[PDB]
Homo-oligomer: A and B are copies of this chain.
Amino acid sequence: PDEAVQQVQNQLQSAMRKLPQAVQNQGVTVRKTGDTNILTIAFVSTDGSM
């Protein structure tokens, strides 16, 4: 997986300069999907002040 993501990132570097400036400002991320989510912690304001 590391080799694959590295190759994908390398190939993308030859194209990020062709993308619209807005897309470049937002940033383009290369990620390996399939990660396991151990927890999903939700933060709630009981008082309602926040």
A interface residues, tally (CB under 8 Å): 21
Q: Digitize A1-43: 1 where CB-to-B-CB distance is under 8 Å, 0 elsewhere.
A: 0110111011001111110010011011111000000000000
Contact in complex: B10, A17 (CB < 8 Å) = no
Please tell me how many copies of the chain the complex holds: 9
Report the nearest B residue to A14, measured CB to CB: B27
Given contacts A2-B3, A27-B24, contact A9 B17 (CB under 8 A): no
Is A15 in contact with B2, judged by CB distance below 8 angstroms?
A: no
Contact A10 B18 (CB under 8 A): no
26 chain-A/chain-B pairs, Cβ below 8 angstroms = A2-B6, A2-B7, A2-B10, A5-B6, A5-B10, A6-B9, A6-B10, A10-B29, A10-B31, A13-B13, A13-B16, A13-B27, A13-B29, A13-B31, A14-B27, A14-B28, A14-B29, A14-B30, A15-B27, A16-B27, A16-B29, A17-B24, A17-B25, A17-B29, A18-B25, A24-B27
